[PDB]
Amino acid sequence: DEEVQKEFEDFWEYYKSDPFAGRNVILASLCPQVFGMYLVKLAVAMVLAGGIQRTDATGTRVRGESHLLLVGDPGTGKSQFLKYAAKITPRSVLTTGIGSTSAGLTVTEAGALVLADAGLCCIDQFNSLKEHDRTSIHEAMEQQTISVAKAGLVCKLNTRTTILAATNPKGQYDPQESVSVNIALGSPLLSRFDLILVLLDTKNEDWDRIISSFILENKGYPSKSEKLWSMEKMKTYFCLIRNLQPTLSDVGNQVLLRYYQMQRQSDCRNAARTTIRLLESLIRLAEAHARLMFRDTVTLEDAITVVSVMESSMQGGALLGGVNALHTSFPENPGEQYQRQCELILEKLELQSLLSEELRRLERL
Amino acid sequence: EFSLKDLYAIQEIQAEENLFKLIVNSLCPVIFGHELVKAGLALALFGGSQKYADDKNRIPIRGDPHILVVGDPGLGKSQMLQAACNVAPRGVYVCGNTTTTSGLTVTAGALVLGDQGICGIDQFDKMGNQHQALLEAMEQQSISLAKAGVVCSLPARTSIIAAANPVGGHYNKAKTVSENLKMGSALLSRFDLVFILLDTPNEHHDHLLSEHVIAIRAKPLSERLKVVPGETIDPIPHQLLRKYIGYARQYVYPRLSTEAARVLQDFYLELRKQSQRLNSSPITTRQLESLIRLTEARARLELREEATKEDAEDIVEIMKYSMLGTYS
Numbered sequence A: 001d002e003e004v005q006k007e008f009e010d011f012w013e014y015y016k017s018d019p020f021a022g023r024n025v026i027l028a029s030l031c032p033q034v035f036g037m038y039l040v041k042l043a044v045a046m047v048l049a050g051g052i053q054r055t056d057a058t059g060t061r062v063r064g065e066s067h068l069l070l071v072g073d074p075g076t077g078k079s080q081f082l083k084y085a086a087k088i089t090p091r092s093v094l095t096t097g098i099g100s101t102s103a104g105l106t107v108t109e110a111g112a113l114v115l116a117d118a119g120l121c122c123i124d125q126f127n128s129l130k131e132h133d134r135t136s137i138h139e140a141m142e143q144q145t146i147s148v149a150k151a152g153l154v155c156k157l158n159t160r161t162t163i164l165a166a167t168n169p170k171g172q173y174d175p176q177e178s179v180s181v182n183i184a185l186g187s188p189l190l191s192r193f194d195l196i197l198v199l200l201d202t203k204n205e206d207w208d209r210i211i212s213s214f215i216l217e218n219k220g221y222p223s224k225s226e227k228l229w230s231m232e233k234m235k236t237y238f239c240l241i242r243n244l245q246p247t248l249s250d251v252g253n254q255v256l257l258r259y260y261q262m263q264r265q266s267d268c269r270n271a272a273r274t275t276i277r278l279l280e281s282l283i284r285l286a287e288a289h290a291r292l293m294f295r296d297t298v299t300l301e302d303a304i305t306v307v308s309v310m311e312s313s314m315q316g317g318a319l320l321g322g323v324n325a326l327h328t329s330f331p332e333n334p335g336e337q338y339q340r341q342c343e344l345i346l347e348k349l350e351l352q353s354l355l356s357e358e359l360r361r362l363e364r365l
Numbered sequence B: 001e002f003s004l005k006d007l008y009a010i011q012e013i014q015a016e017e018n019l020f021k022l023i024v025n026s027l028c029p030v031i032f033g034h035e036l037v038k039a040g041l042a043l044a045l046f047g048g049s050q051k052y053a054d055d056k057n058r059i060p061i062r063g064d065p066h067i068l069v070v071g072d073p074g075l076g077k078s079q080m081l082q083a084a085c086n087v088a089p090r091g092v093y094v095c096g097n098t099t100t101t102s103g104l105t106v107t108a109g110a111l112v113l114g115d116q117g118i119c120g121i122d123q124f125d126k127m128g129n130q131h132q133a134l135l136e137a138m139e140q141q142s143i144s145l146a147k148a149g150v151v152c153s154l155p156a157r158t159s160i161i162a163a164a165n166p167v168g169g170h171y172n173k174a175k176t177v178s179e180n181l182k183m184g185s186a187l188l189s190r191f192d193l194v195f196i197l198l199d200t201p202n203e204h205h206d207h208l209l210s211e212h213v214i215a216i217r218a219k220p221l222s223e224r225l226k227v228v229p230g231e232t233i234d235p236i237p238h239q240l241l242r243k244y245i246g247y248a249r250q251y252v253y254p255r256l257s258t259e260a261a262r263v264l265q266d267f268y269l270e271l272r273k274q275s276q277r278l279n280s281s282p283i284t285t286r287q288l289e290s291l292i293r294l295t296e297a298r299a300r301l302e303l304r305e306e307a308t309k310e311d312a313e314d315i316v317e318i319m320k321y322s323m324l325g326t327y328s
């Protein structure tokens, strides 16, 4: 039907002078029952967008999806995101985790990962997921296929899913003692996860009052303006942008290629988030932000947007600094913030020959 | 459907002067004392309201409380619950030794049969493996299939009321609260009120209690409910009290008023700023929702649709019996 394409073209033709206003309006409707929390509501869109599969000729096939994990103190909104993201996507199977047996996480009969082909399998309560079962998913998380020869049958099945998980920080959380210590998960497992966003509750006297007024006054959607969006429209949007096939560029790759080389050895290179599986994710994330904005050519803007988010993802050790996810609000104007971010990033990792061109493009726009 | 005489009886009961005393002192008349503990069960029997805000997506929030009672043995914390289960449109009583994970949950579990009612569980402490099996049912307000989680969900609306004993039999008075209960910070925050009862050898209380038990076999919100001897407080029969909750639960939906919300906001902002430095159970945003859910409850007992300042002044005194008032 041409009506849907016409309406979406009108929407992303009106917002031509300001390109980031459209993305802000897109993000505002994701889980509109919560207040603020910018980065958390931004990472879910990238995770839900997806990627592109690239299979070699003879035998091999690399992954083309993404995964996410959230850790935070009780009472922050983790379950709301899972429940809301289990509805927008066409096919989803919501599990309990510790309440789910081995018959679901693997093959038996079809379980959960196999039953969620081309979908998204929400998983909750990942802290004590039956260690045998919690480790029998390494093969199904990185190769997108199962390989079992139980009872001498030799059966092979396909399973391509995006996994969302949320686990409590068992033991009082500490700013130091990186998640490998606080959560006590093996290094092999804590490497396939793309973004590990940490949620921490602190001492403030303004967010408390704002959220108290929000809950007490029952003000649904404090932005009383009637823009919003219905769930059907968002479902159509996230089922229609999954057909475009973006291609890389030259003002693009170089930034990520230099960032990885710089990050590989600064002084600590953390302990597990500096492997080759970093450059295989810094591309699958940058190729999703070019599908959320109705185009098929990755440019400097997408690279900067993904680099900032990914650098903020790594808690503690970083190369600019860490910002808490909870205490964030939508900026009043995104254009100036993007202009400042580009100038900040393109200086210390040297590609100043591109800063002048980007400024020339921005001025003439 | 209710008969005409049923409506006449309900209207007559509504006309009583002190409608809170005649309900908080008639749930179980054998037990002497424990006014606030019985008031908690009286509030929990009615419940609150269900919010379907943002009907495009909703993601509904539960509208019923959860009460846990922990104290020394011999106090009588097993007959306040029998009467509570008996006086209910639909109830069920299950022990904590003969039931497993497949018992409480679907395999039709105890929770499913307690739909729109009470599923009071005794001997909560003895459970050691089924603790992590009801955190989903209590919060999500729904339960899925227990066979590899292949969809097939079914509603499960319960108002779990549990009673348990400390780990060391008698609870001694020089330790920390967290190690005398053997509970994590996840299962100790879902419950709305966690009463702690002690057994101390007073003089007047024992002299009255012994007289009461020998006779049987032959202002703050703690004194206005007490009965001064020399008057008649003749209780409503449980048969008539069972046909009042049903009318109250499907013909009135309370809502908050602008005057009441200010007190709750002030109390929340006072609790947080003080207990964020001291050591106690962390106050999440759940308590602000809990105060609303309980203040709505004290508007379905008197058969009204409002929340006056006086009504919101009662979930402030009953709340300071498991929080700050008791943490010391």
Ligand SMILES: Nc1ncnc2c1ncn2[C@@H]1O[C@H](COP(=O)(O)OP(=O)(O)O)[C@@H](O)[C@H]1O
Pocket: A033, A034, A035, A073, A074, A075, A076, A077, A078, A079, A080, A211, A214, A215, B061, B285, B286, B289
């Ligand atoms: N920003 C917010 N606005 C309104 N309610 C919130 C907000 N953040 C958290 N909540 C409340 O917290 C609850 C979420 O609990 P959650 O932290 O997901 O449980 P768990 O710790 O088991 O993951 C919701 O019921 C919601 O009402």
Ligand SMILES: Nc1ncnc2c1ncn2[C@@H]1O[C@H](COP(=O)(O)OP(=O)(O)O)[C@@H](O)[C@H]1O
Pocket: B030, B031, B032, B033, B072, B073, B074, B075, B076, B077, B078, B079, B209, B213
């Ligand atoms: N205030 C009271 N008046 C009369 N009898 C009481 C009172 N308190 C406790 N009892 C007696 O205690 C018994 C209940 O024991 P209970 O404390 O429920 O056991 P447990 O501690 O294992 O739950 C009843 O038989 C009752 O006669």
Ligand SMILES: [Mg+2]
Pocket: A078, A079, A124
């Ligand atoms: Mg949860």
Ligand SMILES: [Mg+2]
Pocket: B077, B078, B122, B123
């Ligand atoms: Mg008992």
